[PDB]
Amino acid sequence: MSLATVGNNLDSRYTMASGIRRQINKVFPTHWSFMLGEIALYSFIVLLLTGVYLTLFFDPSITKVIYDGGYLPLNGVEMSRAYATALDISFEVRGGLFIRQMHHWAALLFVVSMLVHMLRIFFTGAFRRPREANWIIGVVLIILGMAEGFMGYSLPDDLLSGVGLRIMSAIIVGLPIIGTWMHWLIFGGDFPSDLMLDRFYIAHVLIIPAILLGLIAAHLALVWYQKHTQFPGAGRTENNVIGIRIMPLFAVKAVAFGLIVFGFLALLAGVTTINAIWNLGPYNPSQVSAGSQPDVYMLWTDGAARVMPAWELYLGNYTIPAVFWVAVMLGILVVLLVTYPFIERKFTGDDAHHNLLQRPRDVPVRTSLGVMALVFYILLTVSGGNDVYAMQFHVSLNAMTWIGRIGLIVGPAIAYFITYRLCIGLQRSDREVLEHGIETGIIKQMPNGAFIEVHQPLGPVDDHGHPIPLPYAGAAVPKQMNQLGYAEVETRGGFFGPDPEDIRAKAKEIEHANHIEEANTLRALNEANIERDK
Amino acid sequence: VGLRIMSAIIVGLPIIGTWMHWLIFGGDFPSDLMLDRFYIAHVLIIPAILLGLI
Amino acid sequence: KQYTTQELNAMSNEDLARLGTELDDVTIAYRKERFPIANDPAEKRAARAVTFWLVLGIIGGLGFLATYIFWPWEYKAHGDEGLLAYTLYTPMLGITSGLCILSLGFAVVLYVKKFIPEEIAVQRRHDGPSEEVDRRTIVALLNDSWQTSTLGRRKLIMGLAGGGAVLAGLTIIAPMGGMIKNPWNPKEGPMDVQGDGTLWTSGWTLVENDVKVYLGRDTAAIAESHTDATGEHWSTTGVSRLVRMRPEDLAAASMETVFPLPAEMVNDGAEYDPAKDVYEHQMHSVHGPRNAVMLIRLRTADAEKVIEREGQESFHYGDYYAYSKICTHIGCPTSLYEAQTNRILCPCHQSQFDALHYGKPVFGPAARALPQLPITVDEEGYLIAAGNFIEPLGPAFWERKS
Amino acid sequence: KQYTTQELNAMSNEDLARLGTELDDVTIAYRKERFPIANDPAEKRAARAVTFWLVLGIIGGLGFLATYIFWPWEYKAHGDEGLLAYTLYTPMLGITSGLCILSLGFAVVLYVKKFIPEEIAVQRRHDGPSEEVDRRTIVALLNDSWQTSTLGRRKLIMGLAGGGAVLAGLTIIAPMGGMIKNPWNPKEGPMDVQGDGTLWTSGWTLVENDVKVYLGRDTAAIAESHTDATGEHWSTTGVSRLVRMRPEDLAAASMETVFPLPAEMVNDGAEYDPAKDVYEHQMHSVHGPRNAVMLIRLRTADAEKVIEREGQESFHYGDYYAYSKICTHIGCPTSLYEAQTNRILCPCHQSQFDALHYGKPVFGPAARALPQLPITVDEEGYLIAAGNFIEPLGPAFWERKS
């Protein structure tokens, strides 16, 4: 076939035969955690493309028009050109509503996917040496992704977006030397300003996407260069990777998971409404709603402003407003996240070149601090959303603010305590299995009447008839007998009937032969590791 | 006037000229969505492609 | 090592695959076919399972194209027939779009699961500190370039060139000073119904012994359409959004947001000219950032227990008080006037201002009382601003005294 | 090969540089210091030559910062004092900015020229067809993956999956059909002074037995400012850009561009109301793409030798002819009426239309005559369009007959 001619013509010119061989043969581990990041990547792809489709219709201008579009309930209402063009996307373009909702849902999925991916990186310990650079890059990404998404939903100039813009401007003006100067620099004047929405539009469609794309490219390139970490397991060492090659069996799975995420987004974009701007009306600074919170990924920085106890300083001709302290708090919160691996180094007392991951149970301090930060962030989030929470679940609004205040101290401590003790209990169960074997659950009575539970050893048994303890290795310990194969089906066939018996027996024989062959190869690989380590 | 020339050349193509013009400009020339499509084409699309190809 | 072509011509394809994997330090320590048996029914079952999702994806995508093209999609009001189709257009097309892509993904996942072999590929790492040769000669080359170039002996050239470098950076950065603006300039106009830009001013500043400014209520009037042989066009020539108000229009325990309405831009009442277009300026006054004020009429029983602020003694006009609607924390409109508790509430971060204790905060992030507007009735019986705010309204900034 | 650390610890730095270069197949076949002599004056000369441009760049960059910050930069009219500074602001700052960066570049060029050694580095290439092993095992791996995966035996799965792939592409592409619009819809309005969107219509289409449409001349009126205690704002309530015209306003051999002016949007003459804002619609009629027409008054001597087009016999009104101003080639305004040669000329690509031979082209890319507008005086003595264009004006499109 002419495919060989194409390949020949390519390689005779570019000599890629050595390199692409090395690329296709790279090995990637197959844990389920290790494609959370791919979700964020796929969401970013969708964010790009749907965004580019929205720009052929959106007009980022704060100057007014008397609306005369397809949405009849606002004919004659004087509105910003931004809001009018967003409405024309929603109503006058075939399927523009579908697209706009997909863009928004993709933004939410993108941010939460980054959050969960970062949680995996934090708990499993993958940020450690040499990979802390990917942490410093990645934290910047999850900051900018929020910064972008915020100004992304600020653009339509509806009533719910402009209040968040008002909040941002009023926070900037309050800074204790340069606030007025920084505000006049950013907005080009007092708020609302003529040049405001175009600066934010270009910041949203060109600048921050360009930076995110560059940083994501560098991130993935670094992950590819220094190969992926892995969990401890049979035959795994600090100096090797066990998994599947990037093709055929991994690239197709990446394509398939891309398809799944893509289609999931296209479903939820048509089936759930998001940001129904047409019933919010255009922005004017005199109007506000009871539930006027920012997007979900910004609710934490709303909740901070809700829980600060109004401490304000007056110094003669000057004043530090009460909102400077939430800026300090949120900055400290961001600094701690940004610089984490080094404050981990200074107290952990090690600088080793780790390539194997820690199970979160085996590192109770870090996982306890992670759950502590999770409850802190969640209390900030729900305090941001407490207006809705109190309205729906009928808890007094003052009680919600005080729950946020006192909880941001107390609840983290309770989280740390419970998380630490639970982790210790988990690893105690692991040791109990490794030194006594699995508890099958089969209870038998001896002739003496003693009730005994037969335990099924994993390692060899002493001549007294009891297991010899194994050393814990960091790999997961099986805790039941269905996880050793002992509940697998003996019958073969589909629904409504069996396979013929000859096929049945031969298939089961081949299955068991493979099951012992893979055990043998992993066992020999582990023994080779022992020999090669001395 | 150059924009007028471009639109009038597009409309003259011997099957799809009117359709291609209405696609590109969103209607008859001058159109409300014209300058924003060209703005985003100028600041984002073609710079992105030129940067990638370079 | 260094394989000749003869041996490669004598080498089998699976052996060549082994050689290719081994050349990159990857060993396929396990690889087994999914269906070894020839007449195995399980292969038929797997093929059926994959093809089911494939045909589901085919019909899903065809259904998408049909729904996108043919399904009614234009807006329908509440009372219109065919509202059902319009309110299912986006949901139906998205449902089937997602079904198409999701089922194609499911089909590919099942194909890789049931058909492609299992694999355990092991690859060695080459990371950590570099080999001692490369990392010692790379410092040799760099030092050699730095010293065969004689910069390190020449201090004056280096200093002047560093000066030129910082100068180049600074001049590349000074056009970035086009954005820098002085916040305290009056933006080159006498004064507007939105002030002069600076944070010290608002619309009500026009009452600084210059202009008569009524308290204008918002009528929320839209533009009005007019159509004839020339075509449909919208007109604001006969309407006015802001309107004056007499003191008998509020009842006790009532609220209304009022805006500054200079006497020049009033087109209501006995003066109503049907052909005077004042709508643009009135709307331009509504959209001022810092000029919406809550006018509150209290009960007599509650007006007894008011505490006046030092210097704001005579601002009220009987039952009527007039506070600024802009919150003193971050500047959201406060706007939640509890009629019995008499607490003005801000929905953004739950500040509570006691309307009876001169608008002093009682809960939430706010630290400072709402400024108060003096008001009085005019010669004709409408309500007017009897003065300017004595205190800078809005959020606090660094140079704001107190 | 495979150097131990002991030898590298015994190896000299220049030898290490040689080893590093050789490890990448690059040989420095020539490298000589620029100034071997110790007390050489040439080194002093080179240092002076570099430092001269460096100080020039320093003063250039300082001059840029001074000019950017302190030089007057705001607009000055023709009669204003200080016009010189404003008209030198950008030139002065750019002059010194370019001097700064250019002199820094010159300094670096001279430094590399006179100080850094000369070099002749030779490097071998590794390109062209790949080595026979790599390129034979890379086809082994690919074929092995393709055949251990069993796609090539399964035709039905491949066909259905290719169907699903094209279906996924098509549904990812159908929202791109939001842009597609039918060019021949009337854009949902009765009719405007700009037509109904379609290329078959213009403003003058309103004369299709519906509306009285005058030939309106452009007065080029700006909006008028008005300032008082409320502030300066611009008004168009008392002005009108389009104005009617009597037949005695042109002289012989004269031209004027006229636009469609429906009777409803006229605010001139005896009907002039100082408080009727018609400016927006009139300007909305001026900016119609295809409704500017050249009204030409000829000499009597030249009106004798006119050739009328079949069907356009009675369109003129005496000396007055009225052609469409939009060129029939690509649609630039023609607008260059030669008063003696009587050739209407288009500046874009030099089409020439004979105004006497019913506007037929005589030179340039144009192939088709300018359409003609029938005109007649009304009851009051102004000029009105007595009908609609019988021929589609503007550039030709595919479905335009002739």
Ligand code: HEM
């Ligand atoms: C849009 C943002 C991001 C994208 C697209 C992305 C993508 C990826 C992908 C695909 C991987 C490999 C597969 C996997 O680990 O699941 C990965 C690994 C990694 N990510 Fe991210 N990520 C993002 C954000 C972050 C964040 C927020 C952090 C941490 C603060 C981070 C730190 C890391 C590190 C350290 C690794 C390598 C860990 C290892 O090798 O085991 N990344 N990233």
Ligand code: HEM
């Ligand atoms: C090529 C990059 C992008 C482009 C061109 C783009 C374009 C746009 C445009 C024009 C709008 C406003 C128009 C509308 O409301 O439909 C918008 C809104 C929005 N953008 Fe983007 N965007 C891009 C990337 C992103 C990213 C990376 C995120 C998230 C981190 C994001 C999140 C949002 C959100 C949440 C909205 C509001 C949607 C709505 O209110 O309907 N966008 N985008």
Ligand code: FES
């Ligand atoms: S804006 Fe009012 S409490 Fe914050």
Ligand code: FES
């Ligand atoms: S536009 Fe008139 S000659 Fe081309």
